[PDB]
Amino acid sequence: MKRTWQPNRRKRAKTHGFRARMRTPGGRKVLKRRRQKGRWRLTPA
Amino acid sequence: AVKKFKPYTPSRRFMTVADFSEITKTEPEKSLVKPLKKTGGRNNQGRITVRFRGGGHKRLYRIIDFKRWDKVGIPAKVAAIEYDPNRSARIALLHYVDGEKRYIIAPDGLQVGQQVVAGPDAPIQVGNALPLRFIPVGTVVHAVELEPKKGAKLARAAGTSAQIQGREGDYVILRLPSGELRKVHGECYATVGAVGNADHKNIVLGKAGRSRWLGRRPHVRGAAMNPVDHPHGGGEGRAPRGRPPASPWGWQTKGLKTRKRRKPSSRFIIAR
RNA sequence: CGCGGGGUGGAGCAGCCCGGUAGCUCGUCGGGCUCAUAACCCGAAGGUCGUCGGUUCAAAUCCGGCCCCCGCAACCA
RNA sequence: CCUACGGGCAGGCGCCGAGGGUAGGGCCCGUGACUGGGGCGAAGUCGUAACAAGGUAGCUGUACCGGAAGGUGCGGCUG
RNA sequence: CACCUCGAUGUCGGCUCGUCGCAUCCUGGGGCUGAAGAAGGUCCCAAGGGUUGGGCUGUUCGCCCAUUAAAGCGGCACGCG
RNA sequence: UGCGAAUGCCGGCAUGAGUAACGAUAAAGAGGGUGAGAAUCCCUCUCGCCGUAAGCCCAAGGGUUCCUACGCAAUGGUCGUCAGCGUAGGGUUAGGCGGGACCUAAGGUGAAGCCGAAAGGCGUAGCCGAAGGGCAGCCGGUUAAUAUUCCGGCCCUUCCCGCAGGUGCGAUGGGGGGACGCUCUAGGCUAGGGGGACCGGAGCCAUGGACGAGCCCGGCCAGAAGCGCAGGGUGGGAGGUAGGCAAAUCCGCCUCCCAACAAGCUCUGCGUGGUGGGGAAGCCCGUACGGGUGACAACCCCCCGAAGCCAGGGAGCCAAGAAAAGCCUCUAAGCACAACCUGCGGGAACCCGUACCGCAAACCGACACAGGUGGGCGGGUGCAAGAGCACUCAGGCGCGCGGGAGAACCCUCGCCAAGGAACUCUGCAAGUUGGCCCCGUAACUUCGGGAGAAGGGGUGCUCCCUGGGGUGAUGAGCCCCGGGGAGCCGCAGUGAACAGGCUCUGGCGACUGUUUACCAAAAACACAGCUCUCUGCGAACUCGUAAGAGGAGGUAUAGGGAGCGACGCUUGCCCGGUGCCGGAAGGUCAAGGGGAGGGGUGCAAGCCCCGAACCGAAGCCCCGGUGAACGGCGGCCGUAACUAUAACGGUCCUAAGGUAGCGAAAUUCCUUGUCGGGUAAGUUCCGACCUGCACGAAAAGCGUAACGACCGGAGCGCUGUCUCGGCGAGGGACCCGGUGAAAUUGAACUGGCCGUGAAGAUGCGGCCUACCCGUGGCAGGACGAAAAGACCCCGUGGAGCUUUACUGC
RNA sequence: GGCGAGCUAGCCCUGGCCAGGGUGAAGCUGGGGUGAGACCCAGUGGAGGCCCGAACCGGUGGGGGAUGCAAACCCCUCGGA
RNA sequence: CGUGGUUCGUGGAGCCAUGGGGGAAUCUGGGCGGACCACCGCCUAAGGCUAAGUACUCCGGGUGACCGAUAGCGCACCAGU
Ligand SMILES: NC[C@@H]1O[C@H](O[C@H]2[C@@H](O)[C@H](O[C@@H]3[C@@H](O)[C@H](N)C[C@H](N)[C@H]3O[C@H]3O[C@H](CO)[C@@H](O)[C@H](O)[C@H]3N)O[C@@H]2CO)[C@H](N)[C@@H](O)[C@@H]1O
Ligand SMILES: [Mg+2]
Ligand SMILES: [Mg+2]
Ligand SMILES: [Mg+2]
Ligand SMILES: [Mg+2]
Ligand SMILES: [Mg+2]
Ligand SMILES: [Mg+2]
Ligand SMILES: [Mg+2]
Ligand SMILES: [Mg+2]
Ligand SMILES: [Mg+2]
Ligand SMILES: [Mg+2]
Ligand SMILES: [Mg+2]
Ligand SMILES: [Mg+2]
Ligand SMILES: [Mg+2]
Ligand SMILES: [Mg+2]
Ligand SMILES: [Mg+2]
Ligand SMILES: [Mg+2]
Ligand SMILES: [Mg+2]
Ligand SMILES: [Mg+2]
Ligand SMILES: [Mg+2]
Ligand SMILES: [Mg+2]
Ligand SMILES: [Mg+2]
Ligand SMILES: [Mg+2]
Ligand SMILES: [Mg+2]
Ligand SMILES: [Mg+2]
Ligand SMILES: [Mg+2]
Ligand SMILES: [Mg+2]
Ligand SMILES: [Mg+2]
Ligand SMILES: [Mg+2]
Ligand SMILES: [Mg+2]
Ligand SMILES: [Mg+2]
Ligand SMILES: [Mg+2]
Ligand SMILES: [Mg+2]
Ligand SMILES: [Mg+2]
Ligand SMILES: [Mg+2]
Ligand SMILES: [Mg+2]
Ligand SMILES: [Mg+2]
Ligand SMILES: [Mg+2]
Ligand SMILES: [Mg+2]
Ligand SMILES: [Mg+2]
Ligand SMILES: [Mg+2]
Ligand SMILES: [Mg+2]
Ligand SMILES: [Mg+2]
Ligand SMILES: [Mg+2]
Ligand SMILES: [Mg+2]
Ligand SMILES: [Mg+2]
Ligand SMILES: [Mg+2]
Ligand SMILES: [Mg+2]
Ligand SMILES: [Mg+2]
Ligand SMILES: [Mg+2]
Ligand SMILES: [Mg+2]
Ligand SMILES: [Mg+2]
Ligand SMILES: [Mg+2]
Ligand SMILES: [Mg+2]
Ligand SMILES: [Mg+2]
Ligand SMILES: [Mg+2]
Ligand SMILES: [Mg+2]
Ligand SMILES: [Mg+2]
Ligand SMILES: [Mg+2]
Ligand SMILES: [Mg+2]
Ligand SMILES: [Mg+2]
Ligand SMILES: [Mg+2]
Ligand SMILES: [Mg+2]
Ligand SMILES: [Mg+2]
Ligand SMILES: [Mg+2]
Ligand SMILES: [Mg+2]
Ligand SMILES: [Mg+2]
Ligand SMILES: [Mg+2]
Ligand SMILES: [Mg+2]
Ligand SMILES: [Mg+2]
Ligand SMILES: [Mg+2]
Ligand SMILES: [Mg+2]
Ligand SMILES: [Mg+2]
Ligand SMILES: [Mg+2]
Ligand SMILES: [Mg+2]
Ligand SMILES: [Mg+2]
Ligand SMILES: [Mg+2]
Ligand SMILES: [Mg+2]
Ligand SMILES: [Mg+2]
Ligand SMILES: [Mg+2]
Ligand SMILES: [Mg+2]
Ligand SMILES: [Mg+2]
Ligand SMILES: [Mg+2]
Ligand SMILES: [Mg+2]
Ligand SMILES: [Mg+2]
Ligand SMILES: [Mg+2]
Ligand SMILES: [Mg+2]
Ligand SMILES: [Mg+2]
Ligand SMILES: [Mg+2]
Ligand SMILES: [Mg+2]
Ligand SMILES: [Mg+2]
Ligand SMILES: [Mg+2]
Ligand SMILES: [Mg+2]
Ligand SMILES: [Mg+2]
Ligand SMILES: [Mg+2]
Ligand SMILES: [Mg+2]
Ligand SMILES: [Mg+2]
Ligand SMILES: [Mg+2]
Ligand SMILES: [Mg+2]
Ligand SMILES: [Mg+2]
Ligand SMILES: [Mg+2]
Ligand SMILES: [Mg+2]
Ligand SMILES: [Mg+2]
Ligand SMILES: [Mg+2]
Ligand SMILES: [Mg+2]
Ligand SMILES: [Mg+2]
Ligand SMILES: [Mg+2]
Ligand SMILES: [Mg+2]
Ligand SMILES: [Mg+2]
Ligand SMILES: [Mg+2]
Ligand SMILES: [Mg+2]
Ligand SMILES: [Mg+2]
Ligand SMILES: [Mg+2]
Ligand SMILES: [Mg+2]
Ligand SMILES: [Mg+2]
Ligand SMILES: [Mg+2]
Ligand SMILES: [Mg+2]
Ligand SMILES: [Mg+2]
Ligand SMILES: [Mg+2]
Ligand SMILES: [Mg+2]
Ligand SMILES: [Mg+2]
Ligand SMILES: [Mg+2]
Ligand SMILES: [Mg+2]
Ligand SMILES: [Mg+2]
Ligand SMILES: [Mg+2]
Ligand SMILES: [Mg+2]
Ligand SMILES: [Mg+2]
Ligand SMILES: [Mg+2]
Ligand SMILES: [Mg+2]
Ligand SMILES: [Mg+2]
Ligand SMILES: [Mg+2]
Ligand SMILES: [Mg+2]
Ligand SMILES: [Mg+2]
Ligand SMILES: [Mg+2]
Ligand SMILES: [Mg+2]
Ligand SMILES: [Mg+2]
Ligand SMILES: [Mg+2]
Ligand SMILES: [Mg+2]
Ligand SMILES: [Mg+2]
Ligand SMILES: [Mg+2]
Ligand SMILES: [Mg+2]
Ligand SMILES: [Mg+2]
Ligand SMILES: [Mg+2]
Ligand SMILES: [Mg+2]
Ligand SMILES: [Mg+2]
Ligand SMILES: [Mg+2]
Ligand SMILES: [Mg+2]
Ligand SMILES: [Mg+2]
Ligand SMILES: [Mg+2]
Ligand SMILES: [Mg+2]
Ligand SMILES: [Mg+2]
Ligand SMILES: [Mg+2]
Ligand SMILES: [Mg+2]
Ligand SMILES: [Mg+2]
Ligand SMILES: [Mg+2]
Ligand SMILES: [Mg+2]
């Protein structure tokens, strides 16, 4: 029955995307973090 | 003067609708002078700040005219009386000789045909806006201004009036629909007559649904909540208030007065 | 079994707290007014205070046991 | 089968049909825990409404109230 | 009373399947009788086997209806999830 | 720095075990081929299953899964030569299809501006934002794999430039327009489908008959201009003009004059059309798919016909139904050797997607998971209709372990003599009933209902006669609705499939609705409606530190809070306490004002400190009001000419002592109260009494038609629920081949009884019994498994909740 | 201090969907009716949180499932439509 | 008056800072030495700049009674995979 993943490409980028992580200071930090740990991916694809 | 239905379905039984005879040919409520897209929206920026709202028919705002002094001395003929869904009252469409068209909140009386005028001049007959200092004592008048040039704000709901009981200083004394006794400035534009479509008080929605068409969602009694969400929520099978009855936010809701006292406007009031 | 209150002329209640006075209304008895009754007025009578103890100089009153009356509780299971 | 056969009788099917069954109505009678008023029955209880301004003139339609008669409001009549 | 069990011993009633005891409800054998016969009373032996169908209530129990030779009382983690 | 325990951590390997399972009971069988190997790959034939799908096209999502060659270690629940798997190579073509060099929507962002300790929050215009608006391609063929994309045919839009002809041209600005709901719905058409005796077509005559107006197959598709057909759109001229934030010659408005019609003009739809292309059965080829022929195919009449199109059509209704651009008109700067408009001609026309899966083995569910997933198409026949049901077309499937066997037992099914709720907590379950037409139908009622009440009859086929409609002509055909009559057959004609059991009577809730996603669907919530209360509008109220916003572009016939809950009849008494409301007096009271009076130090001037009276708010006190505000609404004793009983009285208390109505109740402890009813029997049910442990009037009181997957009682019908079981079917269980888990597990060589033992012993004691080891079965025991008991206590453990607990904000 | 409304709840903008049958409100027309009316009766008409019933939305009772096909499923039955 | 800082938690509570209120002087002026006064002294507020000694280790070197693949950084290995 309707599970919790209902992937939709526009929402995923609108929500977790790069351009979005960067307006909220709280997320510019998510990037700062992810970059420091050396995540090969700063954001979802 | 209000339509009744045989009970061919429960709710149709007691249900009762408006009379739309005053409505001179209408439907297409004329674009130009209104409509204007209306923003149905039940909360402010984010959060619900008036409870139990939303849903209900889509709506087109009729941009109605509340300052009437805008067109002193220019008369106008009255072309339509039509259904406005954003007020208890019905609205008169009036063609000016100026060429200009706008809407007015339709007084009890205006037949489709009258010339209507506004200004210190102007004959005292239903539909004509004057300043208040020039309207003769004892006249019922409506769509009143509270301070000169600020727009009509008093007595504009179907059937509401306001008698002018006296004059004193640059001010006149009205009885507003609330029974209150208020001094209003003399220069404030009022417009002679009562508001009309006055049976509106007597409609009976009839079923739950009708209350939603109207845009009002179900309203749940504190009584029926838990104590987390309302100062009346608990017991174990219906337990009296058990305190002086209260609103979700805590303040007492039976009797406790609310008007800010220091208000400047106090020095211009006198009743209930 | 638990807790609290109570028992006072015939009825219903004070007095018990703070030791030493027994009081109120009704009723009962005698006498008036009335043709008569009632109402009304004038007079009087009647209690050992549930009981056994104990304290005190002295106990309705302070203490304890027993006898009754009424009320409250008896929950997790 | 009989004949005096292009016949009759037996026999067969059919309509109607007393009544039997199933179903649901109507009307009347009897009866029933209990309950409502009513009549009647020498000397039971409570008050005093009415009859004499009945000691608050009476009566009256209505309405509310009250152990009970009754009282009260509104209007009416005069008996 | 608080002894094993709170790093779990699932609690009433029914149903199913029983098994045991005897302080015997019936049937078998008896003594005594205020036992004429018939039918009973009371006590003794006896556990082979039997010990009904319904109404009410979740009930066990009990009341009741119709019968019956009788419509037994208990134990088994108030036998048995 | 030494391990055996920490339900320790990490890893390895065991037990259960060749055990359960191998994922829908739509179903398989044989021949042939390939290969080391074949139930599992290919092919043929036969069988079965989907067909409002289990077929087909689109959108999401997915991301090489597409196509071909080669291959099988692993993935595939078996096998595997096969594959969505491995390796490699190929494959996605657009001015017109979708999106972008267009528009705006909620919302976002945001010059100006506002606010906030910083971070930041708001915000006019603007900008961004789409499945909405705007916008030009239809059809056939070709590829192993793409196609409205390549090709072919016919058709079209925009930009640039030029030539002609026309005009005051010109816009981010003005106006028109775009531009709009729901239900019903006219006409004409189209998609779609059926029939034909007509036109085309390979063949076919079996098995008793048929060479026949036989059978079987097919009889269209796209298409400019013109033209028909249907429908939408719309008045024309003149003057005045102060409104549409400049200006208009435009629009608005006033007068007047002409048509009032679609006449005219315009637009779309359908038809026809040049041209283009398709084109079955069957037979042959060879598939792993398709190709040849049929053929020079034919290509036509009739009927049924949308929910689609003409479209902005029409009527009714109340809840009263986006924006902006494209478009057109108007003008302003500006320019008018410009520019625009029209026609023609040349040229120019960019970016992204396009494979494939897409109700699923390619998406969301760890899985090739019986679950979930939006739009469109969805044929035929019958059944009254229909997207229902049965069968079926096209198309797609037999669900990736099999073979046998024919036990118990389990699941899903069918049937049962007599009985018929006797079962049980309860008719749970299952049965009965069941579509359509006709007859018929009660109490009660708010007059609509109750109603499918109830209870009944009819239902197939054949022949004869016969009425009306649509289409054609008024006719035949064809399609539709019937009416009457004589017959035939079976156990039975809605002959299969989909298709209510019913009545009586209480409780609660008026009603449709809503709810604890995943143990509660309810008598709970909501609900129209009633009442109280607040709020005069920069409203109250809510969110926010603010700005601001919601309320509301509302205004007391409105908005907030609270209770009650359709409707009928009603809703009593207490304001002493608490709440709120009112009260210009008085009492108290903080800072502050005020300083009489005192003190510290100085030689002194001074400097500095304490401080009475008195003037100083709200709050509280105090005075009053208020009950659809929180709330409350008595005790003893006596009394009548049998007796009981008490209308009457006495007395104590109170703020006042419960009115109407109701009452063993969703409330009654005693209690299975008592009486009546129902039953052979009634702790329940119904009626009644009142002794109300502990009913009672907006946490409403008492009723109420209708309504209910609520809950209680009773009856009829019918039954495997039962007396009481039996038989039968299929899927498992069993055996054989292939693959092969799990909780659990100190170690085991793991018996009964009677004892004992930490009080319930395979493990101690005595006695008894007992050859070793499996398999199918049953669940009494291993205080069997699971979960560090949820109950209970304990911890100066936690957390949600409350208030006249404390203390704060 | 940050991350979440791609599940779920509410609201906002914009689209879409609901076979087929039944019942027959107003209004309208006609007839009766009256001084005029109310009203009556036909026909027409097509209203409704109206009825039956698929899609679709549900989740009533029961059975099965319970190391499942499934960390909520399956079958029969049932509610709205 | 309200608070912060200092060892200072209103304490006899100064000093330094300052949200609010009132509000000077310029050497004979001002601040300070722990309520306040005197005396005796210290120091020049309301403007500013200033190397070094000091902190740290992404990074480079050198050492080790530091680890030796369950250790040692999570990663000795194409791991923030
Ligand atoms: N029969 C009279 C009717 O009913 C009522 O009358 C009845 C009663 O009111 C009346 O009762 C009366 C009473 O009022 C009066 N004040 C006392 C008197 N003793 C009683 O009377 C009764 O008493 C005894 C019993 O002991 C009987 O034997 C006697 O017959 C009977 N009348 O007795 C009547 C019936 O017996 C009304 N009074 C009257 O309005 C009406 O007309
Ligand atoms: Mg869904
Ligand atoms: Mg994921
Ligand atoms: Mg997941
Ligand atoms: Mg999207
Ligand atoms: Mg890298
Ligand atoms: Mg409510
Ligand atoms: Mg609750
Ligand atoms: Mg919360
Ligand atoms: Mg909250
Ligand atoms: Mg609270
Ligand atoms: Mg409460
Ligand atoms: Mg309660
Ligand atoms: Mg006494
Ligand atoms: Mg006396
Ligand atoms: Mg005397
Ligand atoms: Mg004594
Ligand atoms: Mg408790
Ligand atoms: Mg009587
Ligand atoms: Mg009198
Ligand atoms: Mg008298
Ligand atoms: Mg009198
Ligand atoms: Mg009277
Ligand atoms: Mg009395
Ligand atoms: Mg009078
Ligand atoms: Mg113990
Ligand atoms: Mg002990
Ligand atoms: Mg254990
Ligand atoms: Mg014996
Ligand atoms: Mg029973
Ligand atoms: Mg036994
Ligand atoms: Mg016991
Ligand atoms: Mg037991
Ligand atoms: Mg070890
Ligand atoms: Mg050890
Ligand atoms: Mg070890
Ligand atoms: Mg390994
Ligand atoms: Mg085994
Ligand atoms: Mg087995
Ligand atoms: Mg097996
Ligand atoms: Mg399978
Ligand atoms: Mg396909
Ligand atoms: Mg791949
Ligand atoms: Mg191959
Ligand atoms: Mg392999
Ligand atoms: Mg394999
Ligand atoms: Mg598998
Ligand atoms: Mg492939
Ligand atoms: Mg491959
Ligand atoms: Mg496409
Ligand atoms: Mg460009
Ligand atoms: Mg834009
Ligand atoms: Mg912002
Ligand atoms: Mg854009
Ligand atoms: Mg579009
Ligand atoms: Mg396009
Ligand atoms: Mg093609
Ligand atoms: Mg393809
Ligand atoms: Mg022009
Ligand atoms: Mg066609
Ligand atoms: Mg056709
Ligand atoms: Mg030929
Ligand atoms: Mg032959
Ligand atoms: Mg021939
Ligand atoms: Mg055809
Ligand atoms: Mg004109
Ligand atoms: Mg055409
Ligand atoms: Mg054409
Ligand atoms: Mg051709
Ligand atoms: Mg094939
Ligand atoms: Mg229209
Ligand atoms: Mg724009
Ligand atoms: Mg142009
Ligand atoms: Mg493609
Ligand atoms: Mg494709
Ligand atoms: Mg496909
Ligand atoms: Mg689909
Ligand atoms: Mg697939
Ligand atoms: Mg498919
Ligand atoms: Mg999957
Ligand atoms: Mg599979
Ligand atoms: Mg699946
Ligand atoms: Mg049918
Ligand atoms: Mg079907
Ligand atoms: Mg089939
Ligand atoms: Mg096929
Ligand atoms: Mg039978
Ligand atoms: Mg039979
Ligand atoms: Mg029967
Ligand atoms: Mg029974
Ligand atoms: Mg029984
Ligand atoms: Mg049933
Ligand atoms: Mg059935
Ligand atoms: Mg009924
Ligand atoms: Mg037929
Ligand atoms: Mg036949
Ligand atoms: Mg014809
Ligand atoms: Mg039915
Ligand atoms: Mg139904
Ligand atoms: Mg309900
Ligand atoms: Mg739900
Ligand atoms: Mg639930
Ligand atoms: Mg505002
Ligand atoms: Mg607004
Ligand atoms: Mg309520
Ligand atoms: Mg009351
Ligand atoms: Mg009070
Ligand atoms: Mg008071
Ligand atoms: Mg009070
Ligand atoms: Mg007598
Ligand atoms: Mg009670
Ligand atoms: Mg009886
Ligand atoms: Mg019960
Ligand atoms: Mg009471
Ligand atoms: Mg109550
Ligand atoms: Mg109340
Ligand atoms: Mg109620
Ligand atoms: Mg009731
Ligand atoms: Mg319902
Ligand atoms: Mg229900
Ligand atoms: Mg059976
Ligand atoms: Mg053995
Ligand atoms: Mg033992
Ligand atoms: Mg030993
Ligand atoms: Mg032993
Ligand atoms: Mg065994
Ligand atoms: Mg066992
Ligand atoms: Mg077993
Ligand atoms: Mg255990
Ligand atoms: Mg524990
Ligand atoms: Mg604590
Ligand atoms: Mg959401
Ligand atoms: Mg559909
Ligand atoms: Mg409905
Ligand atoms: Mg219904
Ligand atoms: Mg269910
Ligand atoms: Mg449920
Ligand atoms: Mg279930
Ligand atoms: Mg179940
Ligand atoms: Mg059904
Ligand atoms: Mg259904
Ligand atoms: Mg339905
Ligand atoms: Mg301190
Ligand atoms: Mg300062
Ligand atoms: Mg100095
Ligand atoms: Mg110093
Ligand atoms: Mg000093
Ligand atoms: Mg110094
Ligand atoms: Mg300086
Ligand atoms: Mg520096
Ligand atoms: Mg280093
Ligand atoms: Mg290693
Ligand atoms: Mg390591
Ligand atoms: Mg490092
Ligand atoms: Mg590691
Ligand atoms: Mg690496």
mmCIF file of C-alpha atoms (C1' of nucleotides) in Angstrom, chain F residues 42-79:
data_model
loop_
_atom_site.group_PDB
_atom_site.id
_atom_site.type_symbol
_atom_site.label_atom_id
_atom_site.label_comp_id
_atom_site.label_asym_id
_atom_site.label_seq_id
_atom_site.Cartn_x
_atom_site.Cartn_y
_atom_site.Cartn_z
ATOM 1 C "C1'" C F 42 12.978 -22.759 -30.292
ATOM 2 C "C1'" C F 43 8.833 -24.602 -33.799
ATOM 3 C "C1'" U F 44 4.067 -27.223 -34.807
ATOM 4 C "C1'" C F 45 -0.275 -28.940 -33.296
ATOM 5 C "C1'" U F 46 -4.108 -29.913 -29.286
ATOM 6 C "C1'" C F 47 -5.997 -27.957 -24.335
ATOM 7 C "C1'" G F 48 -7.093 -23.925 -20.614
ATOM 8 C "C1'" C F 49 -7.058 -18.467 -18.844
ATOM 9 C "C1'" C F 50 -7.728 -12.922 -19.221
ATOM 10 C "C1'" G F 51 -10.807 -9.680 -22.698
ATOM 11 C "C1'" U F 52 -13.660 -1.925 -18.906
ATOM 12 C "C1'" A F 53 -7.925 -6.670 -19.479
ATOM 13 C "C1'" A F 54 -4.320 -10.076 -17.503
ATOM 14 C "C1'" G F 55 -5.309 -6.011 -24.679
ATOM 15 C "C1'" C F 56 -3.518 -0.884 -26.488
ATOM 16 C "C1'" C F 57 -1.813 4.517 -26.337
ATOM 17 C "C1'" C F 58 -0.229 8.613 -22.890
ATOM 18 C "C1'" A F 59 1.869 11.043 -17.888
ATOM 19 C "C1'" A F 60 5.085 10.055 -13.669
ATOM 20 C "C1'" G F 61 9.053 7.426 -12.054
ATOM 21 C "C1'" G F 62 13.150 4.236 -13.803
ATOM 22 C "C1'" G F 63 17.815 4.880 -16.690
ATOM 23 C "C1'" U F 64 20.572 0.552 -21.719
ATOM 24 C "C1'" U F 65 16.648 -2.739 -18.907
ATOM 25 C "C1'" C F 66 15.833 -1.578 -26.433
ATOM 26 C "C1'" C F 67 18.151 -4.466 -30.999
ATOM 27 C "C1'" U F 68 21.962 -8.212 -32.734
ATOM 28 C "C1'" A F 69 26.191 -11.564 -32.110
ATOM 29 C "C1'" C F 70 28.756 -14.575 -28.472
ATOM 30 C "C1'" G F 71 28.127 -16.826 -23.440
ATOM 31 C "C1'" C F 72 26.112 -19.487 -18.467
ATOM 32 C "C1'" A F 73 30.260 -18.696 -12.847
ATOM 33 C "C1'" A F 74 26.889 -16.073 -10.300
ATOM 34 C "C1'" U F 75 21.537 -13.390 -10.158
ATOM 35 C "C1'" G F 76 16.651 -16.800 -11.795
ATOM 36 C "C1'" G F 77 13.430 -19.973 -5.376
ATOM 37 C "C1'" U F 78 14.210 -26.259 -9.879
ATOM 38 C "C1'" C F 79 16.537 -26.645 -14.833
#
